[PDB]
Ligand binder design. Structure first.
Ligand SMILES: *[C@@H]1O[C@H](CO)[C@@H](O)[C@H](O)[C@H]1NC(C)=O
Ligand SMILES: *[C@@H]1O[C@H](CO)[C@@H](O)[C@H](O)[C@H]1NC(C)=O
Ligand SMILES: *[C@@H]1O[C@H](CO)[C@@H](O)[C@H](O)[C@H]1NC(C)=O
Ligand SMILES: *[C@@H]1O[C@H](CO)[C@@H](O)[C@H](O)[C@H]1NC(C)=O
Ligand SMILES: *[C@@H]1O[C@H](CO)[C@@H](O)[C@H](O)[C@H]1NC(C)=O
Ligand SMILES: *[C@@H]1O[C@H](CO)[C@@H](O)[C@H](O)[C@H]1NC(C)=O
Ligand SMILES: *[C@@H]1O[C@H](CO)[C@@H](O)[C@H](O)[C@H]1NC(C)=O
Ligand SMILES: *[C@@H]1O[C@H](CO)[C@@H](O)[C@H](O)[C@H]1NC(C)=O
Lengths: 476, 476, 476, 476
């Protein structure tokens, strides 16, 4: 009958292993292109990560060597957050830094060379008038930058209370030999340096640092072993081929989505002429694969990630952030997607059967426990903020109470109180003993017991059929 | 009948979602004022926390800049607990500190200025006579403070064995620009400084520190951008409106408490004329809402917290401790109170059904395990106190054995023993191996198994009715 | 009958709450003396701990002040394990230390004074002959100490390869004011100092340290506030009273032990004339209380602990180690013993019902898992000993694998490898990934599941009687 | 019948306690040689570990003393990874190191003496031409080492951009007295030193270190206490005896393997003539003991380990790595093997019954969760690599996410972000909050619930027989 026709095509709509569906009758390979996609996407991501990692290593080493070249009294391994608290000391610092830049060729071991320029920016208030003795001040809140230019020993005067910030900016060129000679990547390193003196807090605490922005290019004229060389970028082609595969498994699985859609309304509309039932929810959910949706999303993300890696390599800005985040989140979703093809073996379906059956319940529970958490987190923030080093911004408080839910860095917290206000110090102890002894044992063990319970129920589903659907009664 | 009348009003006394009670017949909004309360109380607490946080940031920066201005050989990032062990060194220190205060205008970068005064307090024993060679001493235990006053290089003599303490006290005024210009808060900073030399232990170990007390005020005459300004405090009004809302949800829920009270004796006294049973416990407990009690408590605490924030802002002492603790504990209870309105959805009641059904049992268990804990904690204190850095005061021992219950900072503990007394060193290892291997696995896993078990029982309550009460038999 | 007579006295042999036994007919108080014992023993232990703690605090402060007085280039907070690697440096060190001792009165802030003496011990080999160039050495392994005595600048010659060790020994007297004036404790502090130079390893690494031995006495002639004083030790009397109470609850509970014994053979021998069964095990176990045994043991330990605290206070050696360990382990057992009297309430018996029913099974399991642990611990020791900072002695390896069972200091371990030998470095990672991923999840979760299971079974015992004993069938 | 004959010999093939098999009729001892093996193998491994440990202690002390003798400005306890950033500083360093080697006899405390030689290796590029100003470079990538030899103050010129590395190599002989005099081990210590200056990264960051290779020998002419001595190595004989025992328990258990094999085909082939069933899997698995296999493997490994310890001691290279790994993994397997003889008691079989019944399921589960883990680990690597100190190489990322699964070093991770790129900084927080809150609670609690469940099933196996095998139906 009509019934048996439509249900008969349906029976092989749903054959879960594509091995099992093809087992009916022969179809040319699709799944092979998805395995190819995995191998591609991850080979791209690895080949990317290694290169980027070498460039980062070089920027790290160089910015360290700079920290010791241009910061007076940087301890020859490392010091950090170094600040100068007397105005004679700020003057001595400035004089030193500039004198190092001008004497850089005698001083430095590195191949650092100038570009063919030291910009001294001084940002002070338009009309600064401050008299803490009178307990009165008068200001116009503009910023006027009186600048300098130094060429490869000056005179300067800085009225300090007027002074908002200072800066030193000089370009330096470095050539990286190992990376260029061994492999083909751009090996010219332009370095912009900014030595900034934050007076913004106006605490009398002059804060110094050294910022490094590294813009890559290629050496125009380049000779290896007496010959000449030009870097051939094959990864340029490789990105392309990965966009191709990813596009194909975009399309094929889009058709796999919409075909099933039209079979879903085909099914439900069929169902009225005969049995006249609905399940607008159950078997619309059923036909949507939901793993195909993931393949499509990680596909889109891999396309845009690859394109951005391609422009970012060609035009060669090398900021890399928004490209890395995409091309990473994609491979995360792809490798996640491999679980289905583990599942075709059928000895592993439990993690994504119960992880899907656990979520509808946990989400409810999680919400209700999140109310407690917030109400806890605020009070921790304010009451503990003046004193405890960890509770300062609201977020850090979130990483404390999340660290402590998981029982990590505990005794640190009890011992980092300042003890200065006995009342508050004691409060913190009621706070932490409370939170730990509630949100670990009670709430956590309730949550974990919830998931394990769900695992029991899905276990005996795996043992005795499943919840019976009109579909799976009707396909059988 | 009479029965059906009283029970009939009762049926809608208990309609749990106020949505569900109003579902009967229309009532004007109350619950809306409770949601308004939440939004208020937390907006107050956040707007408070941010301001207080900025004031703390400024005090931190400044007291650091002071630590480096007035303490000889403070390493230009930080050193801590710095102490001077030769009397020549104490003299050099004092001379330095005073000389910095008098030269402060040449030295400092900050806008620190004097107030229109250096108080040198020297606290020595009345009749000090000490002769450790004779193994004999004679003292009269009074304290006589021979003081100084310095005005913007002295002669001083300190007999050291007589000397109990020393101090230097000088006011310094600092103006904070960023906070005043960007937002309206008091921006005058009075600083009292106390440089204290503890000889109290008389170990030959002279301990130094720098204490900072910051009293806020407002700049009398103040001009921004060529104009004049006066800070308008709207948060003054905001505190008021929050006291109002909080008072209203105090009153309305008090009536909600007592109304149910008179219905509880109305119910139980009714019950004698007919069925002649009691449940003096069960359904007196039932009528008291217990969530209304919380709303009332967090309400009181929010009232007093707000008033204290208001006086503390107006009169402007700015100690802030007892205000912060209240206004925090309140918002903690309020956000906790949100769980009920999550519960009206009815997919979340499990956490506060089982968290209430778990407490009567756990409390018993907890008590019995607390006996073990104390008996463990004392022996740890004394036997381990001379040697292990962590076990010193009794409390710290409490935070060790609580840290170790939760398995945090373990190898630290085994490695911090002093090994000097082999017998005791070995004892500590029997101690810790024992405690960990008992109080984690055995007692903890028993406790967690208790709560999870309770969760099972309340789960199948959620599945099949509840324990049957004469009330809920009688309302049905 | 005879049966009913003996069983009739037995029925009140076993009345578990002594409240419940006295409920029969009146008996004078015993249990009151046990509560008195608890209050005593712990008040003794606390009053002890505080005093000892103050003496430790003073020794700590003083030995620090010494470390900075007599060790050249001790950084004015702390340095640790400081060693001198050139012979010119050792000479300069020695000269400095001695010069400080002789100039101590100008130098020190403290009240340290000599006793009415600097002993320079030099331990060198009898016949030292060493020639690492010839790859040949000749020695006679004796120790001959050529000593000195210095009186308040020398000439010295040390042949270094012959030199085994050096030492400086000088007594210094310190008077502690706060403790004597505020409370009555001995306040004379004799200090023996030993500055030792370990050359024993003969690595060219000369290791220095400062050892402190503090012998207490009382100031002979002592005047407070113009009057005279002698410290009255009431704690001397207090120790006595505690020995008394402890002795009484020794005796009374010994009789409680042997009475039940003679009722146990009385019972079992009775049982042959009639029913002719044995339970040589079950109801010999039953009559022995097992809590009385604890009271007796903690009693003995409290007696000896108190006596040793009394001699150690009177004769006043003040080593304190073997006294502290006893008097601590006792109070640990006593406070543990309080659980029974919590149990008389009868809402708490579960922890010591199931903790006793869990032990016979766990002990078996524990043994079998200990085999795995040892076999793991050895291989960790040897294979990882040359490289990983943590695995060195066998014991430390035991505290690593115990730290890691409990999941504490993990990333530290993976990051502390030396990476020098790639093969071994990789081995350590198979080692740790293996051990963690076996001995946590598998073995630990098996153990914890064992205890929780036992808790289930004892729960439904608490619900439906118990295992039925011929006794408890026969007393009923 | 034939059936009863073969099954009758079989009944005592399988008697699990060899005590229980011998209980039939007397057999001479085998198991005694296995207990002897355990005692041997571990006594060898301990006696080895101690010796090796003393040699390591001496190398550690000496290489430290060297770090302070030859590295300018090594802080007299320790500094680490010390690097020199100006070419004047590199020159001063070199001059210092060499001057220390030549003056070593005045300088050092140790008995270090030369061997009867300072090799200065300088590795520079063949044709170095570098011009970072032109953004052009030309190189021929060879390495040409222009060397020196110094004999107990030079002139040197190093063109720095050409310079790849530098080195200083000098032998030093040290005699260790304590080890030779107290026990018989080789006590001559040859030290090769390499002071290496890595310029390889060409960051301007010249990295220095001190490498130590220690080759042991024996002192040719050696006299103790006026007499003469030659070290008698009895451990040479001891290794032999252990190889013997290990070989015997190799052979005997090989026969125990193959005998059971021929009884397995004897059994299955027998089974066709009568009942005609197979179980090619079940009872081929059954006859293979699987514990004998372990004894054989740990036996092989102990043989090769012992032989390598013997050659490595005689020829005396003392690299020790591949010997230690073997001789360790063996004793790990042996002590593991002890569990069976614990099992003969029969109160402990549960751990290796359920640990074997848990593995077939977990392995499936573990695989599927490993897919998630990898896909997570890559994205963590790349997206977090530029910034987070922990995520750098892929492996370290593996030890982060394994550290965090187990909840160790958490707050460290949230606080080690660089915050420089707000987008990425926020990403890391979605990353970590996600991973922790999925891979701990959900996946971990699922895994642990799996093992505990398996423990339940094997528990009630222990209670009611086992899965019934035609064998154990047929032997009965
Ligand atoms: C380095 O200093 C010398 C003088 O000491 C000078 O002759 C030389 O030009 C300086 N280096 C450079 C690159 O100018
Ligand atoms: C107050 O302001 C006036 C400028 O009108 C200035 O001359 C005077 O010095 C100020 N007072 C102090 C204490 O600095
Ligand atoms: C700073 O020192 C100079 C002398 O070097 C003196 O003239 C000046 O008055 C000092 N500063 C102040 C604020 O007095
Ligand atoms: C003992 O006290 C007397 C004062 O009566 C003093 O002169 C003498 O120096 C003291 N002894 C010592 C050793 O200081
Ligand atoms: C301290 O040194 C001075 C000389 O500078 C000397 O007169 C005095 O006696 C010394 N102190 C003591 C206690 O001898
Ligand atoms: C070897 O020993 C002799 C003493 O007999 C000594 O003179 C000679 O210097 C030694 N050799 C070396 C290299 O020190
Ligand atoms: C140590 O230096 C002195 C000169 O101060 C010299 O005579 C002696 O020979 C040096 N040591 C050695 C072992 O040469
Ligand atoms: C470019 O290279 C030439 C060598 O042909 C050299 O003379 C010139 O100085 C280089 N330019 C710079 C800026 O160093």
């Amino acid at each position: 009958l009509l019934e048996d026709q439509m249900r008969r095509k349906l029976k092989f709509f749903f054959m879960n292993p594509c091995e099992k569906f093809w087992a009916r009758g022969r179809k040319p390979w699709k799944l092979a292109i998805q395995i190819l996609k995995i191998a591609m996407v991850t080979i791209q991501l690895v080949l990317f990560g290694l290169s980027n990692q070498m460039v980062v290593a070089f920027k790290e080493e160089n910015t360290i060597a700079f920290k010791h070249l241009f910061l007076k009294g940087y301890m020859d391994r490392m010091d950090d957050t170094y600040a100068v608290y007397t105005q004679s000391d700020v003057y001595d610092q400035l004089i030193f830094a500039v004198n190092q830049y001008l004497q850089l060729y005698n001083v430095s071991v590195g191949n650092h060379a100038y570009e063919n320029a030291m910009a001294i920016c001084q940002h002070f208030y338009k009309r600064g008038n401050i008299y803490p003795g009178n307990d009165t001040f008068d200001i116009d809140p503009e910023i006027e930058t009186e600048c300098f230019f130094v060429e490869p020993k000056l005179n300067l005067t800085l009225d300090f209370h007027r002074l908002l910030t200072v800066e030193l900016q000089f370009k330096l060129k470095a050539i990286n030999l190992q990376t260029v000679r061994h492999q083909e990547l751009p090996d010219c390193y332009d370095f912009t340096l900014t030595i900034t003196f934050d007076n913004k807090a106006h605490s009398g605490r002059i804060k110094i640092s050294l910022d490094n922005d590294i813009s890559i290019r290629e050496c125009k004229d380049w000779h290896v072993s007496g010959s000449i060389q030009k870097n051939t970028h094959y990864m340029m082609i490789f990105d392309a081929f990965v966009i191709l595969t990813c596009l194909v498994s975009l399309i094929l699985c889009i058709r796999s989505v919409i075909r099933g859609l039209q079979l879903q309304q085909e099914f439900v509309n069929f169902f009225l002429l005969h049995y006249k039932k609905e399940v607008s929810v159950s078997d619309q959910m059923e036909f949507v694969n939901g793993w195909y949706i993931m393949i499509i999303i990680s596909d889109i993300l891999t396309i845009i990630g690859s394109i951005l890696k391609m422009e970012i390599q060609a035009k060669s800005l090398t900021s890399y952030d928004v490209c890395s985040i995409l091309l990473g989140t994609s491979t995360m979703l792809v490798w996640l997607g491999v679980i289905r093809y583990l599942g075709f073996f059928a000895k592993y379906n439990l993690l994504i059967l119960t992880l899907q059956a656990a979520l509808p319940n946990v989400i409810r529970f999680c919400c209700c426990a999140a109310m407690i958490y917030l109400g806890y987190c605020f009070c921790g923030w304010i009451v503990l903020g003046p004193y405890h080093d960890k509770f300062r911004s609201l977020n850090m408080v979130s990483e404390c109470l999340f660290s402590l839910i998981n029982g990590d860095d505990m005794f640190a917290t009890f011992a980092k109180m300042q003890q200065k206000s006995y009342l508050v110090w004691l409060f913190s102890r009621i706070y932490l003993y409370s939170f730990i002894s509630l949100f670990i044992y009670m709430i956590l063990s309730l949550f974990i017991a919830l998931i394990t319970d769900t695992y029991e129920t899905i276990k005996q589903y795996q043992q005795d059929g499943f919840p019976e659907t009109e579909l799976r009664t009707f396909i059988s």
